[model samples]
Target: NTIRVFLPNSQRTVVNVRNGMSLHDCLMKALKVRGLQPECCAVYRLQDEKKPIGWNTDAAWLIGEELQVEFLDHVPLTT
Candidate 1:
């Protein structure tokens, strides 16, 4: 299935995956397929949500019926 992802600055992207792909797997593929960088990007629960999804999360649990996600610029960890 294809997951539609929303991003800051009014950007949008899509990811192709199967039944139970991990967030990291989907994201890594999305990056490669969409030409995005993870260093300054993050996925959120919604456009207004602040919490980001962990890399290890499963896409099926993290996504909804709309099959969409939100992305935005986020500060990286220092350590």
Candidate 2:
């Protein structure tokens, strides 16, 4: 009961964490639920002087930041 979301790809809701989850796994799941492709999208924290904080960023360090989180193409390939 500690997750607050504001998404831009489509919508939002509260989610549950069950046993045995992988970061990559959960993110892939989220991408799926939002109908996005990993090849076409990525997750990022957008703010003034902000950079990409991946799922690599653990919760203990995520408590206080004026975050602008969104689901978008942050790291797309260029040809």
Candidate 3:
């Protein structure tokens, strides 16, 4: 499965993972490879900022989903 991860400053990344892989773990590794601080960031579905992707979410469930990675301190007030 592949996910489109939007980052702050309009930057984005693409990650490919096995269907049964952990979203959190895959994303964290992807972020680190891009020089982002994983511990200080949070992941969410692009269509709904209020809906955070769980740490244990399966990659298969998020196949082709567009996600956003935001800094903890940058979380929108609407969340």
Candidate 4:
């Protein structure tokens, strides 16, 4: 399976991923190939409810044949 990820800079990339993989791992793999770090980033499914998907969620649980995802920079809370 393949996933098309939209980056924060309006750029996008496509990565080949297999089913049953963690969403976080898939995103990390894609980001690594794109030369980007996974820190302080969020992944959201490009659907009507543009909510951030769980990092530990299984890729197979995501809908659509070719999954569409958005990668955005996020501010992480620090103590």
Query: Candidates sorted by TM-score, descending order?
Result: 3, 4, 1, 2
lDDT of each: 0.60, 0.45, 0.78, 0.66
Best by TM-score: 3
What TM-score against the true fold does each predicted structure earn? 0.57, 0.42, 0.76, 0.67
Better of 3 and 4 by lDDT: 3
Local accuracy of candidate 1 as per-residue lDDT tens digits, 1-79:
6666765556667766667887767767556556665544556655534566665667776554223344454656777
Kindly report which residue stretches of model 2 are placed more than 4 angstroms away from their true locations once superposed. Answer: 18-24, 37-52, 60-79
> 1-79 in candidate 3: lDDT tens per residue?
6889898889888888785888777787778877887667877887744478776788777888898888888655653
Predicted candidate 2 versus true structure: per-residue lDDT over 42-78, tens digit per residue: 4454455556655544533433333334545466556
Estimate, for each residue in 5-44, the C-alpha lDDT of model 4 and write its tens digit.
7776667877566767787777787678767765546677
Error of 3 at 2 (Å): 0.8
Model 4, runs deviating above 4 Å: 63-79
After superposition, candidate 3 runs with Cα above 4 Å error: 48-50, 74-79
Candidate 3 clashes between residue pairs 3 or more apart in a chain or in different chains:
none
Compare candidates 2 and 3 on lDDT and give the better one: 3
